[PDB]
Amino acid sequence: LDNIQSARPFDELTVDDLTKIKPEIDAKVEEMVKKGKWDVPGYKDRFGNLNVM
Amino acid sequence: MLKRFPTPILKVYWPFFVAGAAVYYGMSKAADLSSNTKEFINDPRNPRFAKGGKFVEVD
Amino acid sequence: MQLVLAAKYIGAGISTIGLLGAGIGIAIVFAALINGVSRNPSIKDTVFPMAILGFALSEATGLFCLMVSFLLLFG
Amino acid sequence: MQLVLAAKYIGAGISTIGLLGAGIGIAIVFAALINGVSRNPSIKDTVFPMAILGFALSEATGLFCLMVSFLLLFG
Amino acid sequence: MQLVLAAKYIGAGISTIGLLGAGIGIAIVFAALINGVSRNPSIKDTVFPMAILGFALSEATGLFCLMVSFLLLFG
Amino acid sequence: QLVLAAKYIGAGISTIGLLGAGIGIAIVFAALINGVSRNPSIKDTVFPMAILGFALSEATGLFCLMVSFLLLFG
Amino acid sequence: QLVLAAKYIGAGISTIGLLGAGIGIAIVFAALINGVSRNPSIKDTVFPMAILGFALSEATGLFCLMVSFLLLFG
Amino acid sequence: MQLVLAAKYIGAGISTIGLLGAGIGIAIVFAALINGVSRNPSIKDTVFPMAILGFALSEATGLFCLMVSFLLLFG
Amino acid sequence: MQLVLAAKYIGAGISTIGLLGAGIGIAIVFAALINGVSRNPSIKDTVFPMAILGFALSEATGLFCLMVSFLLLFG
Amino acid sequence: LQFALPHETLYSEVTQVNLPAKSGRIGVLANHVPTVEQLLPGVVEVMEGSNSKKFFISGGFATVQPDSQLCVTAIEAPLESFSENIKNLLAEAKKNVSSSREAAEAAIQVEVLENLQSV
Amino acid sequence: YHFMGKAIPPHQLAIGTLGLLGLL
Amino acid sequence: KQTDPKAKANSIINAIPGNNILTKTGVLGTSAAAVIYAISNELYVIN
Amino acid sequence: SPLDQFEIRTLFGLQSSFIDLSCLNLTTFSLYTIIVLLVITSLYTLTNNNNKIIGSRWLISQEAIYDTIMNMTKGQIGGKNWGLYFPMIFTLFMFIFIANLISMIPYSFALSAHLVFIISLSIVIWLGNTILGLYKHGWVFFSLFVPAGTPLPLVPLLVIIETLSYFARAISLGLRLGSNILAGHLLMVILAGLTFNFMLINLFTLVFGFVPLAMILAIMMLEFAIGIIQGYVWAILTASYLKDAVYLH
Amino acid sequence: MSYAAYLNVAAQAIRSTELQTASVTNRSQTDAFYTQYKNASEPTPMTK
Amino acid sequence: MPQLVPFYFMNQLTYGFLLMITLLILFSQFFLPMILRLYVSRLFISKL
Amino acid sequence: VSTLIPPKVVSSKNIGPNAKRIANVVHFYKSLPQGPAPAIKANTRLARYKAKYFDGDNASGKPLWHFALGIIAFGYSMEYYFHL
């Protein structure tokens, strides 16, 4: 139960904190920009895009 | 603050910039041709008066 | 000199008739939009960009006539 | 300056004609609204804002031809 | 001056052409109302307020024309 | 005199708007016919709306007609 | 200089032809909306025909605008 | 020859009024084209060259109109 | 004289307005042709000569419009 | 020939048929356009020159054929020589059930009933 | 993919008309 | 002077003086003056 | 003169006699460009509370604009590489969307109603389509000018009045936006000028003089719609034009 | 009932002391039962 | 029209194109990927 | 564009039971527990402006009214100084 032992500030977790704990996020975003894919695969299905139309 | 990401903005958008320079030059010559007309040769805020010449004023 | 400004204002008056070609234009576009949404309720999110596109890309031809009117009135 | 002020009145007269576009226009939008409600009375709260939007966007083209008449009357 | 005044009468004559838009349009609205009741009679009480709304909004663009006509008569 | 002649010109011009009523009254009566023919049982309900539409479009034409008479006489 | 004033009347009258162009683009996109709404699987098939017909109708409204520019500037 | 030279430009302006018929006409042709392909997807290869045929055949009127406009403007 | 030489050119500018009749008429003819072919494919060989027959005399009415412009443009 | 209930089939040559279609009443004739339409719960009628004979119906389908034969199909069906108090007492129990999936079926009864009253 | 006079099928034909109206 | 003005207007002046305000003697002591200056000097033209 | 609201006045000033340095100097147009840049900077810098994941209520706005322009340019150019032209299709939006809300503020000034800048921006995008199309597709770029399977005896007519519509595209795209913003602002100022002199005659007019005020309020309600819709229509036509220039039909 | 049956409630509200001699009174009484079937084993019984 | 034809053409166009190149570099390298970092982070916590 | 699509797909899928376990506990151990390093405020004359209007639960649209009032005042001062 080490997962619950470290407590959970997901309402206030910083994206800089994720970049610090995961450079994989920074590398994936950087290569995803370099190739040009502004789409995020599998985002739209569980999270509503909230485009006007 | 903000982490700058090196996005390719030159090997994609070069004809836009070349067109920008061309329209810049063509509008420069258009402005110089329009700034010497009969209506606007005596408007004192044109940049002719700041260098040398003064008041053709024959119309 | 009065004749130039007189015919200038007359031509600027003449060059606003073309907006009746845009009022009816926006009308027919939104009319087809209404009749297309009403007979198929799941087409709105596909037909709405074509509606906005056809709307402004049809007005443009009335706004050209209004710019001819402005270049007459003030130029 | 009697000629140019006589031409102003004629120009304001000519710039009235473009209102017939809006007069047919608002009607075509609301006629499609009625014929869309009669085919399907459940789509009212989806369709009717688009009818109000088309009303506004054609009334704008009507007022763009009214303002030229208001320029030629006074300004 | 007669030359200005006569032209003001001419512009007042010219202006009232745009009212045919409202004359066609109010009738288009009521005709779609008639064709809508004949398909479904139980929707008359819902639809008829928007029919009289369309009458009012189409009479508006005819009375702007009539306003410009009277301003080229008594002003 | 030029002004009285311009009165008759403008009175001639202002009768163009009567074609709006002359077409629109017919669109109302056409929808009336196509409604009665599709459904004969709704005739007594529908017919006063046709009378009302005739009256209102007649008023829109009569506005142009009275502007024509004002340019004639008054 | 009657010609300098009468070219402005010509530039005003020659702008009336856009009346057809606006109604034209409306009828094209109106038929496009009706065609998509009847058959939902025809948009990518028939949409370039709509863009083609729009381009042709504007250019044949644009003739009047270029004649107006030649009268007003030439 | 100031009167005739002015009437050149007036006639060149009034000439292109009839050119709006081609703008409506191309639209009616392509409107029926979209409306026909919308029913039958498999009729495209017959109807589309017939559609461009009707396009050019209706275009010829507006081109003749613009031709008379250029004849009045250039001679 | 210049007074009739102006009127020749102005009347030729007038007489091209009737060309919009042909420009819309060819469109209605080919529009119903396209609707008929898309509705029933196998009736094309019978239907198509009727459309050519309608186009022929509609374009001839366009030429009737245009010939008065040719007659008044050159004497 | 062509106008059938499942228990009892009815008609055979016709000069004018009136039907209560999906969208408002319609009238087929000597040559008519080939069409299918849902038949709403309402009156119908046959013709044989100047012959008036009206039936009620439950609803179903009409189908005008290319070969020109009209086919009309419904479930249950003479005019007033068929269906007042029989209607009335039932209309009572109908409206009652509506206030109750079960009461949705009663909604169907109100419209079908209200229609029959007019005959 | 046109076929003019049973020759080689021409590319798109668009440049030649512009070249004809260019020299005028 | 009024019925409930001596408490409601007092709380209004207190809330006008509750945010770091050294003008708690009169909250409108400088405002009502500058209004008169702007009106009499014609600083805002109705346009 | 109801059109005095578009006057350009020089403020900070700079001149010389050696070189014409009067091109760059802080001006009303220039100051409102600085304001547009600082607003667009403000919509993303201090919007994000301490780089939080959850994305506070301000960031939903700049989330929705991003998503409604991604899902718009994916449905237009939609090919192998649509995202390479996505920053331009977004920064053509946000300039026009912010510069037509700033212009609604009463004592302010329309960047968009200057035809010389917007027509220049349109000609820049048109030449940047033609140069990009020629570079990417050689001499067969002109295959764009023949529509589809067409009969050959009427192909050159359908090439001439296709190319005329191809270089009307240079000025039409700009002059649409210029005409909409200019006509809207000139309409509001002229109706304000008429209702002002309506309310200075005899005191019976300030009574029931609420209906022209309500008409001006209704036109201002309309004017946000006609200002945001044009910001969208610009970004849909210069997505369709990149579809034509990048992919040959 | 349904649409499938639409015209069997429009025919059975429109069923409900004349023609009902055998014919229709019986057209109104149906004695059917359905049962769903799972992994051999059933689900449960109910009137149609 | 008198107001949109001054000498200030090069002024207008200079600050306009500077702002366009500014917003282009600025949007593309800074502000669009700071939204896309939020996207990839939300999806990475979602996939876990 | 197939390769690009594959790259995006791979990123969504990623690479590599144990594959969830040595992901999630290794992610969780340096997740800072109590919302640590909070830094709820600062002093830079705008962070106090950002906290009162723009941060987490305040979030209100009053700065649009502040900004609109700023442009109204600035444009009125300029219009009065030049034309009035």
mmCIF file of C-alpha atoms in Angstrom, chain I residues 11-60:
data_model
loop_
_atom_site.group_PDB
_atom_site.id
_atom_site.type_symbol
_atom_site.label_atom_id
_atom_site.label_comp_id
_atom_site.label_asym_id
_atom_site.label_seq_id
_atom_site.Cartn_x
_atom_site.Cartn_y
_atom_site.Cartn_z
ATOM 1 C CA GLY I 11 -29.914 51.783 -76.006
ATOM 2 C CA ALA I 12 -27.393 49.058 -76.784
ATOM 3 C CA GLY I 13 -26.403 49.152 -73.122
ATOM 4 C CA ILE I 14 -30.067 48.783 -72.161
ATOM 5 C CA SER I 15 -30.852 45.921 -74.510
ATOM 6 C CA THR I 16 -28.450 43.410 -72.941
ATOM 7 C CA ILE I 17 -30.543 43.239 -69.756
ATOM 8 C CA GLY I 18 -32.911 40.750 -71.411
ATOM 9 C CA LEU I 19 -30.045 38.241 -71.688
ATOM 10 C CA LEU I 20 -30.593 37.240 -68.049
ATOM 11 C CA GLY I 21 -33.812 35.589 -69.229
ATOM 12 C CA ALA I 22 -31.864 33.170 -71.399
ATOM 13 C CA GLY I 23 -29.138 32.836 -68.769
ATOM 14 C CA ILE I 24 -31.654 31.560 -66.251
ATOM 15 C CA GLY I 25 -33.745 29.694 -68.836
ATOM 16 C CA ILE I 26 -30.947 27.399 -69.994
ATOM 17 C CA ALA I 27 -30.395 26.673 -66.307
ATOM 18 C CA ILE I 28 -33.998 25.671 -65.578
ATOM 19 C CA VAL I 29 -34.015 23.464 -68.702
ATOM 20 C CA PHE I 30 -30.784 21.634 -67.868
ATOM 21 C CA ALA I 31 -31.788 21.548 -64.192
ATOM 22 C CA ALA I 32 -34.934 19.584 -64.951
ATOM 23 C CA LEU I 33 -32.876 17.500 -67.389
ATOM 24 C CA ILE I 34 -30.420 16.599 -64.615
ATOM 25 C CA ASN I 35 -33.285 15.884 -62.201
ATOM 26 C CA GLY I 36 -34.926 13.604 -64.747
ATOM 27 C CA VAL I 37 -31.771 11.692 -65.656
ATOM 28 C CA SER I 38 -30.846 11.258 -61.989
ATOM 29 C CA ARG I 39 -34.413 10.196 -61.197
ATOM 30 C CA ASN I 40 -34.765 7.763 -64.126
ATOM 31 C CA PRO I 41 -31.553 6.843 -65.980
ATOM 32 C CA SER I 42 -32.981 4.712 -68.797
ATOM 33 C CA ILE I 43 -35.277 7.480 -70.111
ATOM 34 C CA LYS I 44 -32.271 9.622 -71.149
ATOM 35 C CA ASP I 45 -32.409 8.914 -74.896
ATOM 36 C CA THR I 46 -36.009 10.130 -75.034
ATOM 37 C CA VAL I 47 -35.634 13.020 -72.581
ATOM 38 C CA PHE I 48 -32.393 14.629 -73.857
ATOM 39 C CA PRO I 49 -33.684 15.837 -77.304
ATOM 40 C CA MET I 50 -36.542 17.656 -75.563
ATOM 41 C CA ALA I 51 -33.989 19.499 -73.437
ATOM 42 C CA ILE I 52 -32.010 20.376 -76.574
ATOM 43 C CA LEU I 53 -35.262 21.592 -78.176
ATOM 44 C CA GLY I 54 -35.996 23.824 -75.197
ATOM 45 C CA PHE I 55 -32.426 25.142 -75.095
ATOM 46 C CA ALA I 56 -32.551 25.951 -78.820
ATOM 47 C CA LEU I 57 -35.413 28.387 -78.732
ATOM 48 C CA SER I 58 -34.529 29.733 -75.260
ATOM 49 C CA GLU I 59 -31.085 30.649 -76.603
ATOM 50 C CA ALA I 60 -32.912 32.002 -79.659
#
